[PDB]
Amino acid sequence: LGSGFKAERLRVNLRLVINRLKLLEKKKTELAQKARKEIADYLAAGKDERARIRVEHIIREDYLVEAMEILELYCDLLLARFGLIQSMKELDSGLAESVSTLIWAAPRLQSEVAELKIVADQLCAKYSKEYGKLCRTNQIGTVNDRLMHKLSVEAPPKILVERYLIEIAKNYNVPYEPDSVVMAEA
């Protein structure tokens, strides 16, 4: 029968992922400044309720850029230690976090980083579809907890929303009064 694992396709796509992440970190950071300005325009007008909803995107994007930097590290590690993948059949204990986390992250980010799907499919070819499915749910228990947190699809805590609006309002010198209850219960 045979193996679907194509080591060189994994190696190429790991590098492509790193470059794509470096590009998206910069682009997203720049876009985030524009978005903060738009929130300040909301506050100046003084569409408080609308700002509280819309600012959730900025929070998610800020967390995403930090997740991308983590993923960049893991790709670079696998490239550096690539011999351990291709020359040995068992998953190296020290690479388990990097491999599992890349497989977990792929579905979450593939819409913007297409080559991450290829990286994960190849890691699944190498380490089994069964292992891959346990990674995508973190049933495997080795996916990086900080990374998963940054990519959480949970609505941000009210206090975080308030803290972001407070800071944007300061930076643009526009009025804003935080939800006092939210601030108190923090």
Curated annotation (Swiss-Prot):
Cell location: Cytoplasmic vesicle; Cytoplasm, Cytoskeleton, Microtubule organizing center, Centrosome; Midbody; Nucleus envelope
Single Gene Ontology MF annotation: MIT domain binding
List of residues that carry Phosphoserine: 3
UniProt keywords, alphabetically: Cell cycle, Cell division, Cytoplasm, Cytoplasmic vesicle, Cytoskeleton, Nucleus, Phosphoprotein
Sequence similarity: Belongs to the IST1 family.
Subcellular location, principal: cytoplasm
Residue segments, region Interaction with CHMP1A and CHMP1B: 1-167
Phosphotyrosine modifications at: 42
GO biological process: cell division; collateral sprouting; cytoskeleton-dependent cytokinesis; ESCRT III complex disassembly; establishment of protein localization; midbody abscission; multivesicular body assembly; positive regulation of collateral sprouting
Keyword Phosphoprotein applies: yes
Oligomeric and partner information: Interacts with CHMP1A, CHMP1B, VPS4A and VTA1. Interacts with SPAST, STAMBP, and USP8. May interact with VPS37B. May associate with the ESCRT-I complex. Interacts with MITD1, in competition with VSP4. Interacts with SPART (via MIT domain); leading to the recruitment of SPART to midbodies. Interacts with SPAST.
Key word Plastid present: no
Record's function text: ESCRT-III-like protein involved in cytokinesis, nuclear envelope reassembly and endosomal tubulation. Is required for efficient abscission during cytokinesis. Involved in recruiting VPS4A and/or VPS4B to the midbody of dividing cells. During late anaphase, involved in nuclear envelope reassembly and mitotic spindle disassembly together with the ESCRT-III complex: IST1 acts by mediating the recruitment of SPAST to the nuclear membrane, leading to microtubule severing. Recruited to the reforming nuclear envelope (NE) during anaphase by LEMD2.
Protein name: IST1 homolog
GO cellular component, one term: extracellular region
